[PDB]
Design a binder for this molecule. Structure first.
Ligand code: HEM
Ligand SMILES: CC[C@H]1OC(=O)[C@H](C)[C@@H](OC(=O)CCN(C)C)[C@@H](C)C[C@@H](C)C(=O)/C=C/[C@H]1C
Length: 397
């Protein structure tokens, strides 16, 4: 098994909008399958819950490009010295540098500010005299970029460029465009990092700049750039699309929206079912077997690129009964939306804070909130890694 069984690019927007039957037909055949992604990368998909969960945490599957037979491009090579693209001991050292910033209790201190951002965004949206807006434009995009920029020290005029870059690397026009985006962002971050030195800033990037300048063995200039990149990007498309994907799931399932409105203590469980049913990470980041790995008789060679397909894990009926049902009351324990094992999402407390506030705000403030679009007018991103919409037209009384 070297040739792909499927080119997901060829499957078009049908597969972007509703990839589940594809993954499930694969799962019926076996746990691992060669495919060519839309962007043109030949990779393995790992499907099925138990196998997904095990591969995510299995140290046989490195995240370090030194273990990949595909080389990094020059633009990619400027950015790979980050925790998500490292194994221990580098992963361990890098994540210790920021772990305290992202604990549930540290992130709790942002609640007043996150609440204020949401309320301001929601007030402005609610001023449309026709009671129609795009939820993606009004709320889901600007909330997470505001929060993460304040933390990191990205000046407000520089924030809109990240929507552009981050879209380019999710859904590029062509392979060139993703590579150009990366180089542009990378250049920008290097300049931003530079502009911090000697400036006595108190944001997280300023603190990391001093840490690296005081001792480059603790945080190298390449690691300094990779940390800035990963904290910005890793949390970005994900949080934005959690908010919009989840509100889409709630609004397209009126019984569940009604349940939640009648019992707002259902809120945490609802956001967990958003993650399970409509989470933004469709497939996890690249893994590379350090030696050939046998998965029930399918052998993945050492060095090949492996996607763990979280979306299909989440539709495995042995683990999530009646898996196509969006049920805010469901037991979502064991979902893989934030990963599992040493790379488990460091942003999860922050992501949950943002999405819980946002969902509750929309619900309490937008009476008769509803979709303003037939489900088939929506357009989805093709990338097998990220599940995401272009727009989300909504309406309220
Ligand atoms: C709902 C929104 C979010 C989702 C669904 C999400 C999901 C994920 C997933 C699946 C992983 C592991 C990837 C893999 O194992 O291949 C991950 C790791 C990571 N996440 Fe998130 N994340 C979100 C929000 C955030 C935010 C807000 C931040 C930053 C403040 C963030 C920062 C990171 C970082 C730095 C890693 C790498 C951690 C490591 O390698 O140890 N994420 N996330
Ligand atoms: C899970 C977090 C997030 O993924 C990431 O942040 C990826 C690490 C990140 O990819 C890279 O930075 C790769 C750089 N090396 C090639 C050098 C991200 C931009 C991938 C992209 C498809 C995405 O938005 C994917 C976003 C999510 C899947």
């Amino acid at each position: 098994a070297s040739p792909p069984v499927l080119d997901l690019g060829a499957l078009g927007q049908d597969f972007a909008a509703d990839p589940y039957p594809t993954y499930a037909r694969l799962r019926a055949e076996g746990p691992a399958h060669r495919v060519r992604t839309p962007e043109g990368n030949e990779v393995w998909l790992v499907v099925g819950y138990d196998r997904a969960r095990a591969v995510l945490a299995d140290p046989r599957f490195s995240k370090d490009w030194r273990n990949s037979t595909t080389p990094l491009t020059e633009a990619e090579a400027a950015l790979n010295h980050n925790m998500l693209e490292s194994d221990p001991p580098r992963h361990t050292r890098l994540r210790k540098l920021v772990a305290r910033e992202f604990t549930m209790r540290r992130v709790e201190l942002l609640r007043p500010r996150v609440q204020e951002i949401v309320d301001g965004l929601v007030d402005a949206m609610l001023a449309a005299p026709d009671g129609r807006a795009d939820l993606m434009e009004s709320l889901a995009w600007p909330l997470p970029i505001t929060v993460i920029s304040e933390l990191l020290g990205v000046p407000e005029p520089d924030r809109a460029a990240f929507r552009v870059w981050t879209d380019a690397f999710v859904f590029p026009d062509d392979p060139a465009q993703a590579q150009t985006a990366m180089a542009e962002m990378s250049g920008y971050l290097s300049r931003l990092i530079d502009s911090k030195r000697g400036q006595d800033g108190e944001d997280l990037l300023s603190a990391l700049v001093r840490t690296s300048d005081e001792d480059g063995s603790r945080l190298t200039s390449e690691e300094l750039l990779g940390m800035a990149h990963i904290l910005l990007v890793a949390g970005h498309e994900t949080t934005v699309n959690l908010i919009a994907n989840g509100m889409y799931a709630l609004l397209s399932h009126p019984d569940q929206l009604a349940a939640l409105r009648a019992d707002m203590t259902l809120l945490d469980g609802a956001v967990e079912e958003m993650l399970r049913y409509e989470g933004p990470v469709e497939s996890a980041t690249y893994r590379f077997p350090v030696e050939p790995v046998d998965l029930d008789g399918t052998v993945i060679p050492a060095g090949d690129t492996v996607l763990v397909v979280l979306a299909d894990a989440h539709r495995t009926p042995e683990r999530f009964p009646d898996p196509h049902r969006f049920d805010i009351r469901r037991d979502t324990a064991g979902h893989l939306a934030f990963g599992h094992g040493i790379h488990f999402c460091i942003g999860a407390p922050l992501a949950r804070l943002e999405a819980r506030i946002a969902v509750r705000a929309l619900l309490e403030r937008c009476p008769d909130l509803a979709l303003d679009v037939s489900p088939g007018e929506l357009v989805w991103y093709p990338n097998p890694m990220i599940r995401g919409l272009k727009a989300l037209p909504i309406r309220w009384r």
